[PDB]
Structures are given as C-alpha cells and as structure tokens.
C-alpha cells in the first residue's frame, strides 16, 4: 500500500499543505487559548466577607475592625470598637477584588473558601471531558473520517464555548466546558493526524512541529486576549467565535486520502487526491489520477483491537505511557512557574516563549538524532530537571529557575516528539484510536497531578520525586519502542507486523 508515490503524483508540499498547516496551526492556537483560559476566566480575586460597616452606610482602619486577620471566610458579626486601640461565617455575600479582573466564574458563583474545591474540580471536568472526547473521537475518526470529526468538533467547540460564556449556573458552565473539552480532544487528534497523512516525509516533522507550536503561540494568545478582555463572559465568547470561523472554513480541507484509500473507500480518496492536485496546480496528473493508477498503487477500530493485538502491544503501551508522562509533568509544571513572577499574563507569555525554542530544538534534534533517541532525551531531561530541582540548596539565583524552565522546555520537546512518534507508530486503521488512547493517558496524568500533589504532608519532596520519576521512567521506557524514521507510514496492521 505505497502512498508516497500518490503524494508525489499529486502535489507534495504544495500550496495545499502549507495552507492547511497554517489554518490548523491557527485553530490550535485558539484551542490552546480555550484550554488555558481557566487561569483568567477562573482567577481567584482578593475576596472578603461583605460586612455592614464596609460596603453599607479609612478603608484600612475600618477593615481591621470588621474582619479578623483579612480573613476570606469569616467576619466579626459585631465590630469591636476596642480594636483600633465573636466571629461569624461569611453569610452576607462576598466582596471581590475587581481591579485586575472585572469578573470571573469564581467571583460570579462564590467559589471561595467553602466551595474552593470547585475551581479545580471544574478544571478537572474539562480534563475529564478531553479524556472522554478521545474515547469517542479516537475510534470515531477511524470509522467516519479524519476531517468529518474535525469539522464537527470545530462546530461543537464553538457552540459549547458560546454556551459556557452565557452559563446561568455553575453546573451548566461545567457541562458546557465538558462538551467543549470533548470537541477539543476531537480537534487536537484530528488536526495532528490530518497534518501527518498529507505531507511527504521530507517536511512531515516540520509541519507536525508547526502544529505543536500552535499550542506554544496559543500560550501567548491567551495572555493577549485575556489582557484585552477582562470579563470572563466576553473572554469566553471572544475565544469561542474563532471556532465558528474554523468550522466555516473547515469544509475546504481534504479528507486524508491515506485513511480514505486504506479503508474500502476508493472513489472518495480519488476525488480528494484530484482536488489536492487541482489546488496546488498539477496540470496533467489531475486527470492522470485515474482509478487504474490508484489500483496500480495497490490501495473495527474501537479501542478493543488496539490494546490486544499481537503486532503492536509494546508500541501502544509505551506510547500511552509517554503520553501519560507528558500530561503528568506538563500539567504539574504549567502552574509551577508562579514562583518566577507574580504577574499572571507574563507567566502565559513566558510559557509560550520557552515552548517555542524548545519545540524548535526538538525538531532539529529529531531531524538529526531520530524519534526514539530524541524522545528519550526530552523525557529524561524533563524528568531529571525536577529530580535536580529537588536537590537545589534554594538560592534561586541561577539554578532553581534555570532547572524549572529546562523542565518545561523538555516537556514541550517531549510533546512535539511524542505526537510525531505516536502518529507514525500506528497503522492508519488504528492511528486515531491509538492517539486517542494517548490523549486519554495524558488527561489522566493531568487529572492525577493535583491529586499526587497532596503528598506534601508526608514529605515536601515526595510530590517532586513522583513528578520527576514518572518522566524518567517513561523516557527509559521510550528506549524500547521501535525507531520510526526512513520508514513509510504504516496504514494497516499487516504493515506493522511486517516491520
Ligand atoms: O492539551 C493540551 N493543552 C496545552 O496547553 C498544551 N501545550 C502543549 O505544548 N501541548 C498541549 N496539550
């Protein structure tokens, strides 16, 4: 089933591939904005208990007499006039700090100091959504299309985001964040695969790196939009409309002809190849793509076949392990830069600006070393920066922050290498199912991150020890799965079993 011959008869690396890469990178930027805006639409302001002597009838002088030390969950039922020289719970409302953020979900639904474990839970739900999303968008994309799921996931992202921007109660907001996360999983996996299966190997790592840099630039776009737009409602709506645009233009993409011709469909694959030839101006071969030529090229995915198949069991388990390590470390480390600076937008900008050169260096490394050595190196670096950060004598001059940022760079490199490795490591029949299993593992790691952060009671170093031991062991396990370079993309189980 030789497809690179067809990608060369048709336009390879033509204007179609670059246009698709740009559009999908932009959509990924907006998707990262959706994912990372829980730091801005759910930011916790400086709150206190609504007291009769403050907000009814000096601030600093009249606040010390009406709120015990300022406590965010209790207030003096009756102020003690013998305090300038007997408490009560926060039953009068709340008063938030509306100077940095005009409004957020935390301030809107009073998720403070008694329901404080609802801001993380909501985030967890989002992660859970992506998990479930993969479980229903991985196999589905392997049965109905790489682009059909992408288009309907764009539409679902737009609709769910616009509905969450107008949620009247917290459960409705959580439900629509869950549905948005479902569509987010669909979009991420289908975008990665669709870029994987339309670019010739010459510039396949490059376009996958551009797609991954989509998230890196979305980390800065989040800060830009959240700086321009402060209210959580307007922020969510302004991030969700771009996905209405993405769904609108997503009908001009081409269904991945590798998947199309891999399955029993041939007229659809022929039409997509002819359209791609017409887009990038291939004159003679547009009509010389007759079904005779396609036959001369010589060309049910429900998570129940992938994880039990003799041909690929080490591949799936190790790839999902590396995905889990990436999710674990990345979502335990994204919020770990708070010690670098107090500013909140600068942290998002910093994450983007340290993932950009990390992914460029990973692209160079994998185009020089190879997928497996570079993945092992990136995971080992990301998992050993933490195990060395836990040994720093805490002078935080030029060692603590350096390791903290090298860990993030290694995590970004690991992600941009594991996307390529997982896409190239599985047959086109099970490519999206396996990438969906990887996304489920990554979201499971992200969910379990804060849960294992609770180990600080038994030891200040145990959470860091786990957060660094998982990537080290995953990278040392990423030296067992087979190398995938100068090998054509497998598009059936027999192709993998041939290797
Ligand atoms: O689900 C994700 N959210 C991100 O913010 C991100 N950033 C990155 O590099 N990969 C991912 N994946």
Author numbering: 1 to 57, 68 to 79, 85 to 100, 112 to 325, 334 to 533
Lines from the paper:
The reabsorption process of urate in the kidney by the urate transporter URAT1 plays a pivotal role in controlling serum urate levels. URAT1 (SLC22A12) is a member of the SLC22 major facilitator superfamily transporters. The cryo-EM structures show that hURAT1 has the common architecture of SLC22 family transporters, which is formed by the N-terminal domain (NTD) with an extracellular protrusion and the C-terminal domain (CTD). Structural comparison between different conformations of hURAT1 reveals the rocker-switch-like mechanism for urate transport.
In the presence of substrate urate, hURAT1 predominantly adopts the outward-facing conformation, in which regions of the NTD and CTD in the inner leaflet of the plasma membrane bind to each other to seal the intracellular gate. Urate binds in the center of the transmembrane domain of hURAT1. The three protrusions on the electron density match the three oxygens on urate, unambiguously defining the binding pose of urate. The xanthine core of urate is wrapped by a hydrophobic cage consisting of five phenylalanines, including F241 of the NTD and F360, F364, F365, and F449 of the CTD. In addition to the binding by these five phenylalanines, the negatively charged 2’-oxygen of urate (pKa ~5.4)20 is coordinated by R477 on M11 and the 8’-OH of urate binds K393 on M8. In the outward-facing conformation, the lower regions of the NTD and CTD bind together to form the cytoplasmic gate below the urate-binding site. Particularly, F449 in the CTD blocks urate release through the cytoplasmic exit. On the cytosolic side of hURAT1, we found that E223 on M4 and R284 on H4 of the NTD made electrostatic interactions with R465 on M11 of the CTD and D525 on the loop between M12 and H7, respectively. To evaluate the functional importance of the observed polar interactions on the transporting activity of hURAT1, we mutated them into alanines to disrupt the interactions. We found that R465A and R284A mutants dramatically decreased the urate uptake activity of hURAT1, although with slightly decreased surface expression level, suggesting that both R465-E223 and R284-D525 interaction pairs play critical roles in stabilizing hURAT1 in the outward-facing conformation.
